[PDB]
């Protein structure tokens, strides 16, 4: 591509229909009751710009102010399938992006000088759009500098930086004239979808097993054992696999069991009710609620308790969906103790439906296969009546990282549904741990105040914290960005060596000697094994 020989993208025959079908389902059958009015179509516009120009880099402010005149019209376009503003706004900026990469190549030839006091703001997600071509060219000068500098700091000659950043920018141009009419369609439907809730999606038509199983282990403190179940996800027939392993562990006289659901991001709700059932006799696990107003109770029907021994549940900020059900049930029945970070807050069920009707091959046989949509149909509620959503399971024992406010969680996703409560279900608590908790905590706090790995974690936190202003403001000075890397490498080598002398291992002469496959310690697991034994002691 040397010029504007980028194909002009047009809406395909099928698309008008496919749009009408998407709009029908979103506007009628979504848990979220919204009006596709002017306010909504205006918000669908701003999201759509943020999908074309993420960093506010490619379009003129005048490009934006011109199309913006026409943003309350998007609800009409979607309902009718005439997506002219979506196709026009994409076509321009198909041009603008071309003419930014043809400029970025020109600038790569100029002399490189990394000795200024300029910074670079990584977050133009909310910046004003460039007012004119001089400001456009300035934002793209910064960008080829940042691209050059980040490469230079991997020890590259000015010569091989131009050779690699040409490869990149020239491929950015090929990507650009290889996009198709469905690409633009997909992104219009995505702006719509993602303005309802963060889990709603359009899914384009298709173009021309035991690795994720339960691992069990045992870990000792003196003469006493603790079984640990690493559960990677709620895969179908999980409850069968842990039943095998709960027998292996029952016999080996283990004092306590840990279910490890860290970074376990969900799976089959049924595996969550069946697993809950291994630990509590009978009772309701979860209240599900539908788009129209109606509640339902999943229960555990086999009234037998496959393991009555002391139980502990290890979760982090990435424990989600089904994991939060399970963890929430054990907490609510006081069947098991919860340790780690507050969980994600995924309190909602999404359903796939096809945009394909049985009479399509019949009437419009020229057409291709049509897409499918994914959208929220149900919410989850705990047996105590509260919702999983945007609150998550909060641990009985919160590791230090959980007291720190993080930027990861359903709560931080755009237009995530709010937090709700319905009435509690009828259930009888299998036990009560309010009794043991302040003592488990006395011990926990005493232990980690000494542990140097938890000292290292609580130092990491003070750092991450104190350097959150400059969070998205990177220096463009090679010296300062060479020194920054050396002080990171140096603090890492010191940590690794502080550790190796505790352990009677040889110290490392340099960071590069560390095996590629070195395993870090798991201080969170190691401290929970102690919590598990403390609990066993107290019953």
């Amino acid at each position: 591509t040397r010029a504007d020989q980028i194909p002009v993208l047009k809406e395909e025959t099928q698309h008008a229909t496919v749009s009408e079908r998407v709009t029908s389902r979103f506007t009628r059958s979504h848990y979220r009751q919204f009006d596709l009015d002017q306010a909504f179509s205006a918000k669908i516009f701003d999201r759509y710009l943020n999908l074309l120009d993420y960093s506010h880099n490619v379009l003129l402010a005048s490009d934006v102010e011109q199309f913006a005149k026409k943003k309350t019209e998007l609800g009409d376009e979607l309902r009718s399938g005439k997506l002219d503003v979506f196709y026009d706004l994409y076509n321009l900026a198909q041009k603008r992006r071309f003419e930014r990469y043809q400029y970025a190549l020109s600038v790569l030839e100029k002399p490189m000088d990394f000795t200024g006091n300029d910074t670079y703001n990584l977050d133009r997600s909310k910046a004003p759009w460039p007012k004119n071509e001089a400001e456009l060219n300035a934002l793209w000068d910064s960008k080829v500098k940042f691209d050059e500098l980040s490469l230079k700091l991997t020890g590259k000659t000015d010569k091989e930086i131009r050779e690699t950043l040409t490869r990149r920018y020239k491929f950015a141009i090929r990507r650009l004239a290889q996009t198709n009419s469905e690409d633009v369609f997909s992104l219009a439907m995505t702006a719509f979808a993602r303005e309802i809730d963060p889990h709603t999606n359009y899914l384009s038509p298709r173009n021309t097993l035991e690795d994720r199983a339960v691992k069990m282990s045992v870990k000792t403190v003196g003469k006493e054992k603790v079984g640990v179940l690493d559960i990677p996800g709620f895969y179908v027939g999980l409850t069968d696999d842990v039943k095998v392993q709960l027998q292996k562990l029952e016999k080996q006289n283990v004092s306590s069991v840990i279910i490890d659901l860290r970074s376990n991001g969900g799976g089959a709700l049924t595996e969550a009710v069946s697993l809950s059932g291994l630990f509590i006799p009978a009772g309701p696990i979860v209240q599900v609620r539908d788009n129209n107003g109606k509640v339902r109770e999943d229960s555990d029907t086999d009234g037998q308790v496959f393991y009555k021994g002391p139980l502990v549940v290890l979760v982090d900020r990435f424990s989600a969906s089904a994991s939060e059900i399970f963890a929430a049930a054990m907490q609510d029945y006081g069947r098991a103790l919860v340790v780690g970070e507050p969980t994600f807050g995924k309190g909602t069920v999404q359903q796939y439906r096809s945009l394909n009707r049985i009479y399509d091959q019949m009437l419009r046989p020229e057409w291709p296969a049509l897409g499918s949509v994914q959208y929220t149909i149900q919410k989850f509620y705990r047996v105590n009546g509260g919702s999983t959503q945007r609150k998550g399971v909060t641990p009985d024992i919160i590791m230090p990282t959980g007291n720190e406010e993080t930027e990861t969680g359903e709560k931080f996703e755009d237009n995530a549904l709010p937090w709700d409560s319905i009435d509690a279900a009828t259930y009888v608590k299998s036990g009560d741990l309010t009794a043991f908790e302040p003592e488990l905590l006395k011990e926990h706090n005493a232990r980690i105040a000494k542990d140097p790995e938890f000292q290292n974690i609580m130092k990491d936190i003070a750092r991450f914290n104190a350097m959150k202003d400059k969070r998205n403001i990177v220096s463009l000075n090679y010296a300062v960005r060479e020194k920054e890397n050396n002080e990171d490498d140096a603090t890492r080598l010191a940590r690794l060596n502080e550790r190796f002398k505790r352990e009677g291992k040889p110290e490392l002469k340099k960071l590069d000697d560390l095996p590629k496959d070195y395993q870090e310690p798991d201080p969170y697991l190691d401290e929970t094994v102690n919590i598990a034994l403390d609990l066993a002691k107290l019953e």
Partner: protein
């Protein structure tokens, strides 16, 4: 009380089923006319209260010719009776995509959205169906039920207009007149007896009027009178009247409050 003999399967109805049962076992038929008859029999099965067996014949119709809007009509209705409004909406969309003048899809989709918590979307459909025939009093009645949920005051003024500007001929306007406060329920039933001719007519009058009286009392929160009136509406076995189907659904949502 005003009571009819509950309607019973007529001999014409039973004879036709037996004929069809065999015209459909003799393999002497087009696909297009095997599909037309399977639809014809579902309407008969439906008219008898045998919705599962009709769903069966209608699915067998669309597995053969998926071109048929009339069949999606019934599939959608059953889906509305069953509580599954999402799937109902899908079916009626199919109906108006295959034939956009299929007006009764608007009523059925509108009712379906009504039971499915989407009033404003129901109003659009029920008003399209009103404007197709402003003299039919039940088109005004369904729109009223859908409006009276957000704004009773407006719903009433609009019904009043719909009535005033109509020719006030067909029986149904007497139900409308009682909703409006013009005539007592006493008079409403006096006029019912007067308008009814034979027992089949009396059952039809009672199916309708018991459902609308039913919906009316439920407004006031009188679950007991509502319940009695829905049961009495259903007790006429006018199986294929919307009021029958929806007096059963009403009764089903009231046997889900007490649970």
């Amino acid at each position: 009380e005003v009571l009819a003999v509950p309607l019973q399967p007529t001999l014409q109805q039973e004879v036709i089923l037996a004929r069809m049962e065999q015209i459909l076992a003799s393999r002497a038929l087009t696909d297009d006319e095997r599909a037309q008859l399977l639809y014809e029999r579902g309407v008969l099965y439906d008219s008898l209260g045998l919705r599962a067996l009709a769903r069966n014949d209608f699915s067998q119709a669309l597995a053969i010719r998926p071109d048929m809007p009339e069949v999606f009509n019934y599939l959608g209705i059953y889906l509305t009776q069953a509580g599954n409004f999402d799937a109902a909406y899908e079916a009626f969309d199919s109906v108006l995509e295959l034939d956009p003048t299929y007006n009764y899809a608007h009523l059925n989709r509108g009712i379906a959205l009504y039971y499915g918590g989407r009033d404003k979307l129901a109003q659009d459909d029920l008003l399209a169906f009103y404007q197709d025939d402003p003299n039919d009093p039940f088109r005004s009645l369904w729109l009223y039920l859908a409006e009276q949920k957000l704004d009773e005051k407006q719903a009433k003024e609009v019904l009043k207009q719909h009535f005033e500007k109509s020719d006030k001929e067909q029986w149904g306007w007497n139900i409308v007149e009682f909703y409006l406060g013009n005539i007592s329920e006493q008079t409403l039933m006096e006029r019912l007896k007067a308008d009814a001719t034979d027992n089949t007519s009396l059952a039809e009058h009672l199916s309708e009027t018991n459902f609308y009286l039913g919906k009316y009392y439920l407004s006031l929160g009188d679950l007991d009178s509502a319940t009695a009136l829905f049961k009495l509406a259903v007790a006429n076995n006018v199986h294929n009247f919307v009021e029958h189907r929806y007096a059963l659904l009403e009764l089903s949502l009231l046997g889900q409050d007490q649970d």
